[PDB]
Amino acid sequence: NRIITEYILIDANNYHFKSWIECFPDCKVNLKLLLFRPEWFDFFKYVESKTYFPQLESKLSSYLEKRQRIVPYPELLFNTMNVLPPGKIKVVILGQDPYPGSCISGVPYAMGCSFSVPLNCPVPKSLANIYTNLIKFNHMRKAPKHGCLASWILQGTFMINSAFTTVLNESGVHARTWESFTADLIDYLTDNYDDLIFVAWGAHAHKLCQRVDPKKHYIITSSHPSPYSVSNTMTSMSYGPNPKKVTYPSFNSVDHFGKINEHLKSRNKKPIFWDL
Numbered sequence: 001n002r003i004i005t006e007y008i009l010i011d012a013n014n015y016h017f018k019s020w021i022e023c024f025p026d027c028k029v030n031l032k033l034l035l036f037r038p039e040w041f042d043f044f045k046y047v048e049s050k051t052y053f054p055q056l057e058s059k060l061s062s063y064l065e066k067r068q069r070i071v072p073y074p075e076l077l078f079n080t081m082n083v084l085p086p087g088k089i090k091v092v093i094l095g096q097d098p099y100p101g102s103c104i105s106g107v108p109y110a111m112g113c114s115f116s117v118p119l120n121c122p123v124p125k126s127l128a129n130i131y132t133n134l135i136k137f138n139h140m141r142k143a144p145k146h147g148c149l150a151s152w153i154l155q156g157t158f159m160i161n162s163a164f165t166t167v168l169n170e171s172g173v174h175a176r177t178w179e180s181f182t183a184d185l186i187d188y189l190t191d192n193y194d195d196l197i198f199v200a201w202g203a204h205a206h207k208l209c210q211r212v213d214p215k216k217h218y219i220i221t222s223s224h225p226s227p228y229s230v231s232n233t234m235t236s237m238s239y240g241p242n243p244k245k246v247t248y249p250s251f252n253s254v255d256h257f258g259k260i261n262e263h264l265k266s267r268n269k270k271p272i273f274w275d276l
Contacts, residue, residue, distance in 0.1 A: 007076065008083050008150040010118035012107040017073040020064055024074070027064040029057045034077045039085030043188045052180040059177055060165070069168035072098055072110035079112030080160050083153050086189060090156035090269060091197040091260055094205040097163045097172040099124065108168060114159040116149035123147040129225040129251065137255040140275045155272045160185075162208055186211050195267055197260055201225055201251060203236040210239050218263050222254045 024030070035044055047053055063070055072079070095114025102108045109117045115127050123131075127147050134140035153159055162182045165174045186208060189196060196217050200206040202224030209219050223234035230251045238246040257274055264271055 004083055004154070005150070007079055008113075008153060009148060010076075010111055012103050012105070012118040012120045015105075015107045015118065017075045019073055020070045021067065024061075024064060027061045029060040029064065031057060031060075031077070034074050036078075036082045037085055039087065040078075040081050043086065043185070046188065047181060047184050050180065050184070056177065056181060063167075070165050071100070071102075071108040071168050072112045072165070073108065076110075076112035077164060080114075080153055080158055084156060084158055086193065088156050089158040089189065089193065089196060090264065090272065091158065091199060092186075092189065093157060093159045093199045093201070094208055095159070095161040096202070096204050097175065098161050098166050100166050100169055100171045102168060110166070112164075113149060113153060114161045115147075116153075116159065117147040119146045119148050121147060126224070126226045129227065129230045133225070133252055133255075134257060134274055136252070137258050139257045139261075151276050152272065152274065157272060158189075162204070182208070183211065190217060197263055199256060199260070202229065203234060206234075206236045206248070207239075220254070220256060220259050221248045222256065223248065223251045225251045 021027075032044060032048070035041070060070070093114055098110035098112075099108070099117065100110075103121055107118065107121070109121055109124070111118055115124070115130065117124060117127070123143075124147060128143065131140065131143040135143065149157070149159060160182075162178065163172065163175050164178045164181070167173050190212050194216060198209045198212050198217055198219045200209040200219060200221040205224075206221050209221070212219060221236070223229040223232055232250050234248045234250070235245045236248060238244055261271060
């Protein structure tokens, strides 16, 4: 019933998405119905055949039975995938958990994309720090007044949270729930596509990016842009035959988007315009 801008370019003052209990009045959670982009059906067909998948829909249904306010709303749950078919992904930026907060009016900040928030919401501090980094390395001259990343995602920036849901006003309460789904999503992308760019901000995203073959794909690692880590180095477990903690630079010292640009250009791929 909608076109893509209606899902990805969201206005908090004109927010008509149904909540979970409205889409599933009888708690009959059906994640497949939340995926509007046909190029993902093959991946989804692989995921429903796994034994964890009924467990996932069971846990979500149980949260609805207890009347928990799951965010983001289900028409936004798979937002980044509904914008981007897998064959059009150029950069994967992992978040951890969705924003738990909301506007005065009850519009959630979570919109099914990592780091992004609807128009006419406050810019979260992590995202402000990302903008600061873009300004510092000459990719942008002034911070946008909003926090809506529709522009980057439409151009192939696959910005998802490894935990696709949380509960309104509670941080990270569904961290185990999505781990197998997200692992299969990462594995699907790295098995079927080549020379993606993975951006690992923080130790959790870095663990996830060590599922990825670093000779087949390009992995960029630093600390997280949140104010608690933006200007400090990060220590993160480097897995393998001889596991050891390694130190990675602070977020605000790395030219993340310059590095994305140079890698895309070195493979003759179309660039991403960060400012527009």
